[PDB]
Design a protein around this ligand. Structure first.
Ligand SMILES: O=C(O)c1ccc(-c2cccnc2)cc1
Ligand SMILES: O=C(O)c1ccc(-c2cccnc2)cc1
Ligand SMILES: [Ca+2]
Ligand SMILES: [Ca+2]
Lengths: 111, 90, 111, 90
């Protein structure tokens, strides 16, 4: 139900081993977290049972990622905050593209 | 020293009258050119994209666009209903 | 060796049935073309045998796509032009994100 | 009526002295603020991103950024070595 995919615009590659923290609005309660794979993807964050309606924030730790590659980051993280499952359960993929001074995110939502 | 600019990728225009709150702090609403001047460590710029889309009658994915960075800075955000990108020019 | 993936930022979905034309620099010679799947992906454009070094242009037909959905497009197409395989064969994925008045593309290149 | 603006997403700055050729037509190189004024159906704006990156000592993926559209227009391009995004504001 919640997938994150991250690409690196500086290296021309997936963004590998990037930390992703998901929080749910209670204050922001920790909900789920993970690290992207060698494909830049993070599956297994959560389950249909755990993924309730509410306001979720996904924070992708772009600062650590760039610092580990030896690159100066501008942002602390790339984030996405969205209301989930309000009219019914859905599946969300958050796709992100990273550069040191810019990031882009989009959502794909399926029923 | 800190400017915010907001653009609409659907209609190809500035995003007018968008609420922008800066934390660490400053706030405003965007002008007819999509810019917010005169707002004024680690800063958060929270752009009320949900109200912008809903005024247009478009269902948007995000609650807001929040951009968090360490500190003359221009923070631009390009909006679509299910995406946003943001840039810093310094 | 050459994959294209396309997402729609207006609908929150893959960009389905979008035409993609690839040309190689001779004038631009037709090289390969296809349409994205229900996942927004286009596999099977070309083969390791056919994919030689050279300058390639990938043109994604964003105008037809938006017109078919009833949306006014600004661009004629989203394009990407790049030198391929110069220091050796590689695999290229071109990922694109579409809005009516904007598009983004990135490349993932693997050996 | 037609402005071009080019920004660098790696260094967080305008892209200075970039060659831009418009077809249908006009050409120029970007200024210290990354803008090209005074350039002046279907138009192509070809931005020489490869020369920009190679002057910085960075190997870039694209040959150029070419943006083709049907026609006051601002065409912005945000550059990274393996990506570019482009916006039209009208
Ligand atoms: O289909 C995909 O895997 C995929 C497609 C496009 C992106 C993408 C492109 C540009 C900006 N942001 C995200 C990311 C992933
Ligand atoms: O200053 C501007 O006009 C301007 C600033 C930023 C962008 C932009 C942002 C994200 C992706 N692509 C382009 C575009 C234009
Ligand atoms: Ca509900
Ligand atoms: Ca060679």
């Amino acid at each position: 139900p919640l997938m994150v995919k991250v690409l690196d615009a500086v290296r021309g590659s997936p963004a590998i081993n990037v930390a992703v923290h998901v929080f749910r609005k209670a204050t922001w309660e920790p909900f789920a977290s993970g690290k992207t794979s060698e494909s830049g993807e993070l599956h297994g964050l959560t389950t249909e049972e755990e993924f309730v309606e509410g306001i979720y924030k996904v924070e992708i730790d772009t600062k650590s990622y760039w610092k580990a590659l030896g690159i100066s980051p501008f942002h602390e993280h790339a984030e996405v905050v969205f209301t989930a499952n309000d009219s019914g359960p859905r599946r969300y993929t958050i796709a992100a593209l990273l550069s040191p001074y810019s990031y882009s995110t989009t959502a794909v939502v399926t029923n």
